[PDB]
Amino acid sequence: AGILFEDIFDVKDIDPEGKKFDRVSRLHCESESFKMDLILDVNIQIYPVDLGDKFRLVIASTLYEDGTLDDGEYNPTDDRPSRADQFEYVMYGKVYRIEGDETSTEAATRLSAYVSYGGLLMRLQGDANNLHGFEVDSRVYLLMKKLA
Amino acid sequence: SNRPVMGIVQDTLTAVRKFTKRDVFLERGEVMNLLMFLSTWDGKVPQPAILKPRPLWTGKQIFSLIIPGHINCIRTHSTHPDDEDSGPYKHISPGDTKVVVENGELIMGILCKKSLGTSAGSLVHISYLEMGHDITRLFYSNIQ
Amino acid sequence: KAFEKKFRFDYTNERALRRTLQEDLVKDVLSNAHIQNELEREFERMREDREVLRVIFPTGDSKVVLPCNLLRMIWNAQKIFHINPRLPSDLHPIKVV
Amino acid sequence: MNAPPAFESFLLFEGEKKITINKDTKVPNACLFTINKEDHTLGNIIKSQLLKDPQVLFAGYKVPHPLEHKIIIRVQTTPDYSPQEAFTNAITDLISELSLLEERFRVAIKDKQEG
Numbered sequence: 399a400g401i402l403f404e405d406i407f408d409v410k411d412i413d414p415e416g417k418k419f420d421r422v423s424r425l426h427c428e429s430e431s432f433k434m435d436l437i438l439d440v441n442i443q444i445y446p447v448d449l450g451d452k453f454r455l456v457i458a459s460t461l462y463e464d465g466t467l468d469d470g471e472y473n474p475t476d477d478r479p480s481r482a483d484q485f486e487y488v489m490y491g492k493v494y495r496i497e498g499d500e501t502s503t504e505a506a507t508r509l510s511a512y513v514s515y516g517g518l519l520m521r522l523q524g525d526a527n528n529l530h531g532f533e534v535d536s537r538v539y540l541l542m543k544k545l546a
Numbered sequence: 547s548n549r550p551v552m553g554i555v556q557d558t559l560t561a562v563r564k565f566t567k568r569d570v571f572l573e574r575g576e577v578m579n580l581l582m583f584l585s586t587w588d589g590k591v592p593q594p595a596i597l598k599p600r601p602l603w604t605g606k607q608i609f610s611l612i613i614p615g616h617i618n619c620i621r622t623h624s625t626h627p628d629d630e631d632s633g634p635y636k637h638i639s640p641g642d643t644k645v646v647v648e649n650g651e652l653i654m655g656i657l658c659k660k661s662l663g664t665s666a667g668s669l670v671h672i673s674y675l676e677m678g679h680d681i682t683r684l685f686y687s688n689i690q
Numbered sequence: 691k692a693f694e695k696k697f698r699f700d701y702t703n704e705r706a707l708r709r710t711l712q713e714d715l716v717k718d719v720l721s722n723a724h725i726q727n728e729l730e731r732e733f734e735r736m737r738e739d740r741e742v743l744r745v746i747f748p749t750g751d752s753k754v755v756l757p758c759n760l761l762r763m764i765w766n767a768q769k770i771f772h773i774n775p776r777l778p779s780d781l782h783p784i785k786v787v
Numbered sequence: 788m789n790a791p792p793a794f795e796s797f798l799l800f801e802g803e804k805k806i807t808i809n810k811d812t813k814v815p816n817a818c819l820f821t822i823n824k825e826d827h828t829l830g831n832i833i834k835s836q837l838l839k840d841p842q843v844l845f846a847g848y849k850v851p852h853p854l855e856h857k858i859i860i861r862v863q864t865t866p867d868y869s870p871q872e873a874f875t876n877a878i879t880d881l882i883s884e885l886s887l888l889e890e891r892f893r894v895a896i897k898d899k900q901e902g
Contacts, residue, residue: 503703
């Protein structure tokens with residue numbers, strides 16, 4: 399398995415701060431199941447995105463579906479049984495910050511995860527119950543597909 | 547003045563900034579060329595930031611291979627506003643305008659004179675202090 | 691107020707201790723009084739150093755030139771040893787002092 | 788007074804081997820090709836042809852110094868295939884493409900001239 403997160407998101411804004419980069423825009427997405435808030439930077443030319451679009455977002459530790467570490471190297475020739483390639487848009491990055499709602503006295507109810515995909519950043523806020531699978535300085539794959 | 551004397555100057559600094567912006571996506575052959583011009587490269591091609599539509603690398607992703615050892619540094623770009631630190635988006639800067647290097651890897655930010663130049667606490671100064679003179683030489687040459 | 695809150699090591703709450711320090715070590719910290727005496731002596735030394743600093747640096751300029759960068763060094767250690775801030779620590783507060 | 792003669796761009800002297808092959812110890816199945824007295828004309832061609840081979844993992848070239856006339860080519864291939872074989876196959880494919888291009892260019896010239 400190795401799937402840390404999975405949900406369906408609705409695109410609410412594209413550039414609220416204005417378009418600061420030509421090929422990159424910042425999706426603000428709400429979530430229809432868990433009410434997880436999402437901020438994501440997406441390459442526009444490679445994968446256009448418009449307002450009011452349903453896409454399924456999956457965050458996984460490995461692409462191989464079997465529980466085998468990917469070792470973090472590029473090898474396009476490796477025909478392992480699946481590359482979890484059922485998704486249109488795939489990114490690779492690392493978690494660099496996990497903020498929380500904790501005080502000194504009691505534990506966090508809402509967490510936020512900060513992932514950088516080679517310069518493209520994502521923030522994912524919501525309840526800590528389903529967001530516990532993330533650990534800082536760990537490798538994370540992003541998986542996206544549009545829905546009808 | 548306990549500062550580095552040598553810095554990145556002329557074409558190379560402007561190219562550093564334009565290369566380290568977010569919009570820079572590098573194709574496979576371009577990546578192989580840039581890695582061919584690395585002297586300290588270990589010979590392993592990093593996994594691209596973008597995989598499926600096409601394999602696309604990023605400028606920060608290749609700059610992280612230039613950065614030697616495991617260097618921890620935090621600077622700010624010249625165009626950094628003071629509004630971002632107050633409200634939200636503190637750690638997800640919308641203009642790309644804060645610099646974070648963790649474990650010898652550029653996570654976010656646009657480099658400029660305030661990061662690669664001759665100033666106290668610069669990336670080159672921290673590299674010298676952590677790694678010594680022999681590795682900082684290769685760091686200048688590889689950047690160039 | 692902020693200086694005391696940040697540097698006093700309050701050990702009365704126990705619940706912040708249970709969150710920050712390990713289960714095996716919080717009992718040792720709470721039962722022994724020699725530990726508490728040493729930890730109060732540390733804060734007394736820190737108050738004295740604060741008074742010395744306020745004598746040395748009027749106008750309150752906190753920028754000082756010193757040999758080795760302790761914040762960068764602590765940050766290097768955190769990344770070298772894969773330290774998780776979300777988990778309780780096993781470092782005994784006596785050994786720090 | 789220090790000007791090199793016009794021919795170091797194009798001509799070998801006693802002792803220079805046109806090609807020198809050195810294995811790369813950093814990565815398995817990696818080799819380093821040194822071509823003397825050549826320039827971008829040939830390096831870009833060979834690199835572009837090598838990048839089409841599905842069994843080639845890395846392919847790049849560079850001129851170490853423009854004032855010197857020397858090409859270095861690095862080829863890394865998958866485990867069951869030699870970068871030497873990749874280089875020979877690339878050269879043969881380039882020659883085969885060029886011969887066909889020459890023949891079709893001659894046919895086009897003849898069709899253009901007699902209407």
